[PDB]
Design a protein around this nucleic acid. Structure first.
Lengths: 147, 102, 98, 203, 201
RNA sequence: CAGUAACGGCGAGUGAACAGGGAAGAGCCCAGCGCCGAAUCCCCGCCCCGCGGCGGGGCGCGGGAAAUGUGGCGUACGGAAG
RNA sequence: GGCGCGCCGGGCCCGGGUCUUCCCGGAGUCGGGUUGCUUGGGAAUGCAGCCCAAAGCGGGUGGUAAACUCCAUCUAAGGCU
RNA sequence: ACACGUGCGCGAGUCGGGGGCUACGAAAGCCGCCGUGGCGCAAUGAAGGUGAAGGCCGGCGCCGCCGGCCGAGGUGGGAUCC
């Protein structure tokens, strides 16, 4: 909508909302990211700290699939398997624990953030954190490794 | 004392039973066949040697196969190639110590 | 939601229009410069015709191009969310009964 | 077969046998014109590989190309640009001298169609290449179904477009990590995709 | 020039980009163009599967994707040989072949053997002359139920085995899973210099 | 994927690839190595069908190309012979 | 102008499996040095000039130069589509 | 392209935009074993990599296992309720 805009309310004025002294000239600061170490240094220092310079090692042919390891917390570990299993786990008499194949749902590591509800599990996760191990052992479960 | 299959370490990966498969016929290209050995052995007797081979030979006859190694590494191309050339120029030279004996 | 969904999906059956890229810029025009008592407009190169020394390049110049010629890579089509699309039809059928 | 013996003898170019023949023929080739018809292949063996079947309509021109790189054609070495484009002497032409040979054989013999070519000698000043030419209109080629691909209008002037085996090697195509810059058709086709805004209708 | 807290952003519009703007007013006409050709082909390949020949069960490469299964290029030559299909006859009866595909596992091999076993039983084979049913053909009452298979032929589905709940055993409770991974890291990395210092010692 | 790995007075700027999801989907032929008596090819004369894409069948101590290699089998997925 | 139903004209006298004896590859080209252009390609991604010049359990690739190992992965310097 | 404000939808999800299925209509409707993928749900480190509460009561004036229950802070000010 061109009619809702500021351009329509600037018909009848003169400078069109770009100053009478400092006129709307073409590029009075240089084009793009110019003067980043010269006359736009203070903007870059105050708002983009670290912009200039190198750090760390160059890795030439980086493929993003070699370093693929999507993580799930213990906070939402039970949401991977149906709500029926968590119901059927507690009520039944045997003491059989349900299996949460974390790789089936599309995560390769189990991090240990949430309070894990006090009933056993067997977690077939590809990787584990040290806490995520301790939480499952504490509730009374298995940290089954898989590849 | 039972382990699990782990996705990282010295013996990583998923469980796979391996098929005893014959290596494909493209793999055996450049294998020295009975007949093509004879042809290169035949043309060697007809043609002779390249001047750089003959110069490298005369560096092996004075028994300097580093100054001969450093030579062929400039002449033929790489280190892997110049080493194989030194191995084979010494092999044709061993037969000249045989063929003159009797 | 009926107004919003109607007035975005009605932009989708809309054919492009544009001024030709060469329109106004099919001349060899060149400004007379800083004398000659004329206003520095790119004047059409010499001849025995009406156009000889008129004024070619500019939105204001007769002949010429327009200001910011309309391009066919204007975003003609506005995409709406499926849930919002559904909640236009649910509301539209609902008002039909009343 | 004799061809395998000629094949491996032609790999011993530093031998006394071939250094006599590559020199005495290279003399004979200088005395001839820069482009003339050879009555046969100089190498019967090499021409077999590159597709020369010795039947009527198959032609072989021995053309020579003046040896060296390419110096920039500018008057008195003055390129009136930025110090990058000041270069003239140590510059190199993008296509090989074997490809420069084929596209003189094919340009001269416009009626014929260039198959391939092979090296037959080099001096300080010249290289010498036999260029295999084919008649698209001789009925020996026009009827043979495995050599009637050249007889179709798609293969007019292969040598001029870098479709000949020598011509292809100047382009930088092939599969894998080394040949990314000509993925698609060519270096020109790669460039276009990468510098085209796919401005979708909806976006 | 930057005004305040903005994003240090770099548009790729420093070239003559307006010449090479690819617009998509072709799109709805293209979708009809492809669809008209897809129909006209399907009516040509008259009783045959519309989507084309069978593709094998293929694992995706790279550790990201090897939990998934695709449609491949074509069947391996040992997948056809163990199945008992000739590589030149496979193509004619609607089986994709590629000679490039190795077989490293018996799992993927015997899965794609069992794939071709399911296919040939599903296959209905017309005589090359209507008035002459030859020996390697099917029966007339089984030839009249032949309909074009809309969708990809024997669609390749990604399913996990039905495992039930277990009473957790005492090695499973007492498997230090974190320290196992951290030991394995060291036993992969340091191994080379243990075998090197075992040479020196 | 990705304005990413990387390039860059590492400044301004530049900048792919694989995997994955689709459209389409199709594979192949030689030389060489060898085997069969060049088993192969182009063209001229006559008869005969026949075509406004000059092709088909004869019939000729008719000519030529070709052993400096034509044709059939066969090409890395192996192949050939018994 | 397609598309098969029946005759006839001439062509074509073909397969598959196991077994054992044999056969098996493109060179002034790869490759190396150097120069210039080039690329996202960084101790050189590609291309070209000149020079050096291969091998046959070989050769190429394996995104950091090199030596020493295993391994993996394709068959380059010919062609059609 | 980015930022922030505001309106709408859904909500730890969300979105087909690319593809596919069925005059106005090149529209619209549909897909979910088309959610590939994007962004969000996890950060930090140059990288190798690592990756987000505890105290108690006991079995051997304690210490690592054995065990048990309750357990996502505290203070101050706080619209609103009581």
């Amino acid at each position: 909508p061109s009619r809702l805009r500021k351009t329509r309310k600037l018909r009848g004025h003169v400078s069109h909302g770009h100053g009478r002294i400092g006129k709307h000239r073409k590029h009075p600061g240089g084009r793009g990211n110019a003067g980043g170490m010269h006359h736009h240094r203070i903007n870059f220092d105050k708002y983009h700290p670290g912009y200039f310079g190198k750090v760390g090692m160059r890795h030439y042919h980086l493929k993003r699939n070699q370093s693929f390891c999507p993580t799930v917390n213990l906070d939402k570990l039970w949401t991977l398997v149906s709500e029926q299993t968590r119901v059927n786990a507690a009520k039944n008499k045997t003491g059989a624990a349900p299996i949460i194949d974390v790789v089936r749902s599309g995560y390769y590591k189990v991090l240990g953030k949430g309070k894990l509800p006090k009933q056993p599990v067997i977690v077939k996760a590809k990787f584990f954190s040290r806490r995520a191990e301790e939480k499952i052992k504490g509730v009374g479960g298995a940290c089954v490794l898989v590849a | 004392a039972l382990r699990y299959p782990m996705a990282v370490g010295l013996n990583k990966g998923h469980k796979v039973t391996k098929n005893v498969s014959k290596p494909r016929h493209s793999r055996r290209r450049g294998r020295l066949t009975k007949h093509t050995k004879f042809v290169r052995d035949m043309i060697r007797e007809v043609c002779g040697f390249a001047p750089y081979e003959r110069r490298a030979m005369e560096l092996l006859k004075v028994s300097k196969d580093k100054r001969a190694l450093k030579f062929i590494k400039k002449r033929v191309g790489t280190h892997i190639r110049a080493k194989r050339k030194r191995e084979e120029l010494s092999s044709v030279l061993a037969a000249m110590r045989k063929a003159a004996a009797k | 939601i009926v107004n919003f969904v109607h007035t975005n999906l009605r932009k989708n059956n809309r054919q492009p229009y544009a001024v030709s890229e060469l329109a106004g810029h099919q001349t060899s025009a060149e400004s007379w410069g800083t004398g000659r008592a004329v206003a520095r407009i790119p004047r059409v190169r010499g001849g025995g015709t009406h156009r000889s020394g008129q004024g070619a390049f500019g939105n204001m110049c007769r002949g010429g191009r327009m200001f910011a010629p309309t391009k066919t890579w204007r975003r003609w089509h506005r995409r709406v969310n499926t849930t919002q699309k559904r909640y236009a039809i649910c509301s539209a059928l609902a008002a039909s009964a009343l | 077969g004799a061809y395998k013996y000629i094949q491996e003898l032609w790999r011993k170019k530093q031998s006394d046998v071939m250094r006599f023949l590559l020199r005495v023929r290279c003399w004979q080739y200088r005395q001839l014109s820069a482009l003339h018809r050879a009555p046969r292949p100089t190498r019967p063996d090499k021409a077999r590989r590159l597709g020369y079947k010795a039947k009527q309509g198959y032609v072989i021109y021995r053309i020579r190309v003046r040896r060296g790189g390419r110096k920039r054609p500018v008057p008195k070495g003055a390129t009136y640009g930025k110090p990058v484009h000041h270069g003239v002497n140590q510059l190199k032409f993008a296509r090989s001298l074997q490809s420069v040979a084929e596209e003189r054989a094919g340009r001269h013999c416009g009626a014929l169609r260039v198959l391939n070519s092979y090296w037959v000698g080099e001096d300080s000043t010249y290289k010498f290449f036999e260029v295999i030419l084919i008649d698209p209109f001789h009925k020996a080629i026009r009827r043979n179904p495995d050599t009637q691909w050249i007889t179709k209008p798609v293969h007019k002037h292969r040598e001029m477009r870098g479709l000949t085996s020598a011509g292809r090697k100047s382009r930088g195509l092939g599969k894998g990590h080394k040949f990314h810059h000509t993925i698609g058709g060519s270096r020109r086709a790669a460039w276009r995709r990468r510098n085209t805004l796919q401005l979708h209708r909806y976006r | 020039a930057p005004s305040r807290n903005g994003m240090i952003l770099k548009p790729h519009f420093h070239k003559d980009w307006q010449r090479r703007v690819a617009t998509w007013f072709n799109q709805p006409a293209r979708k009809i163009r492809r669809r008209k050709a897809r129909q006209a082909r399907a009516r040509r390949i008259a009783p045959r599967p519309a989507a084309g020949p069978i593709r094998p069960i293929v694992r995706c490469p790279t550790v990201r994707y090897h939990t998934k299964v695709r449609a491949g290029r074509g069947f391996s030559l040992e997948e056809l040989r163990v199945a008992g299909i000739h590589k030149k006859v496979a193509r004619t009866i609607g089986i994709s072949v590629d000679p490039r595909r190795r077989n490293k596992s018996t799992e993927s091999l015997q899965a794609n053997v069992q794939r071709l076993k399911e296919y040939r039983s599903k296959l209905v084979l017309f005589p090359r002359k209507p008035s002459a049913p030859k020996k390697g053909d099917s029966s007339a009452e089984e030839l009249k139920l032949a309909t074009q298979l809309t969708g990809p032929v024997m669609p390749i589905r990604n399913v996990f085995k039905k495992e039930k709940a277990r009473v957790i055993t005492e090695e499973e409770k007492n498997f230090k899973a974190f320290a196992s991974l951290r030991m394995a890291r060291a036993n992969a990395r340091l191994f080379g210099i243990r075998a090197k210092r075992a040479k020196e010692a």
